[PDB]
Amino acid sequence: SSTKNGRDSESKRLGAKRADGQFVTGGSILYRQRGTKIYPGENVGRGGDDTLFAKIDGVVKFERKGRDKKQVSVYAVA
Amino acid sequence: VRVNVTLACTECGDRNYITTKNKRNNPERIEMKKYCPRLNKYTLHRET
Amino acid sequence: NRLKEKFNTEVTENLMKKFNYSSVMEVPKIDKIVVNMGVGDAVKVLDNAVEELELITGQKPLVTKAKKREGMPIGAKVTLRGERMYEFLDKLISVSLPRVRDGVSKKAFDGRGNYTLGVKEQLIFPEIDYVSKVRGMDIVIVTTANTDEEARELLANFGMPF
């Protein structure tokens, strides 16, 4: 006969876009995601589609928050 | 929702503000205050 | 009310002695009741239920709605405390309960200190003498006492025909 399957959507290239310890400029996307898999930390914003972005120039730090949650911050380079 | 609408100002001849509504839900001409560039203030834009 | 006075003076010492306590706060002090007038009717009927409940309590009731259809007002209840609590309990025990049958049960404890006593017809209470039909309007008393047996003495001290 025939298959009823065969469909899929375009992959959305989610995940980390900058490395921990890397210097980024303001507006740089740090993380693409659905929901808050990683939370916005210090000097980091959360866009309408849950994109995390740096609000300042600085160094990216991925850190833990609480017991089972994560966050990413950006800190001004001294 | 159901149909596109255009809201018109009482001074501006522009119809910049298009939006939608449900005809069964809101059969009456909907109106709301919107910012008007040519007057530089909020005025009353009403459905055409 | 006189019931509050008798609780403060009469029932307090007798209850303290019967169930030995070290302080008067361990003494049972019935928290409240709930005049739940449930009307399982779709529609007209709920207005009569609201009017009857407002008659037998003196305060407006809250129209309750189902949780599963949804948003249809099903139940109705009124909450009383303090003076309204004691006055209504006195009226229900001295007039309404003898006007129906002989009295409330002695096994209908929720297992914790809550005594569910559900009147079988709206004609028992001394109001709305006139009249639509009987209604399963349940009166559930809540109390501070942690045990079920620490509450029969309190209801009897207020005059419950156990």
């Binding site: 006969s1 025939s2 298959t3 399957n5 | - | -």
Partner: protein, 137 residues
């Protein structure tokens, strides 16, 4: 036994058969067991035939535990069809058996009777087996 009453997905990737037995490597309900020393799929028909052999020889009286269940469905295409055009339909149900897995356990009969019954059952199975007792120090 025979088969699950229901499964979420009736068309499943076939299980991996390399490696050793993950669990169920000890006699835990009875006195004696049949331990697999060789890897294979085991079908529900093979299980049922082995069970009938063992319980018939034991003449009831004893207790029989079947430790493996055919959770996995497998599919088969119709006879004489070209490749492609989707996956086939469920043909049967199988369990994966790797060395060390106890297949059957028995209790309530003598050691000699258990040995004979388990040998008879093992001749119905697609794996090499060894008679094992309940493990102590």
């Amino acid at each position: 036994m025979l088969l699950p009453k229901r499964v979420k997905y009736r068309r499943q990737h076939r299980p991996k058969t390399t490696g050793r037995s993950k669990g169920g490597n000890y006699v835990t309900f009875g006195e004696f067991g049949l331990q697999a020393t060789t890897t294979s799929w085991i079908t529900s028909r093979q299980i049922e035939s082995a069970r009938i052999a063992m319980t018939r020889y034991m003449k009831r009286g004893g207790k029989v535990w079947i430790k493996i269940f055919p959770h996995t469905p497998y599919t088969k295409k119709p006879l004489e069809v070209r490749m492609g055009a989707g996956k086939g339909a469920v043909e049967g149900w199988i369990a994966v058996v790797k060395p060390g897995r106890i297949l059957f356990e028995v209790a309530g009969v003598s050691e000699e009777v258990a040995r004979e019954a388990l040998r008879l059952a093992s001749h119905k199975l697609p794996v090499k087996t060894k008679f094992v007792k309940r493990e102590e120090l």
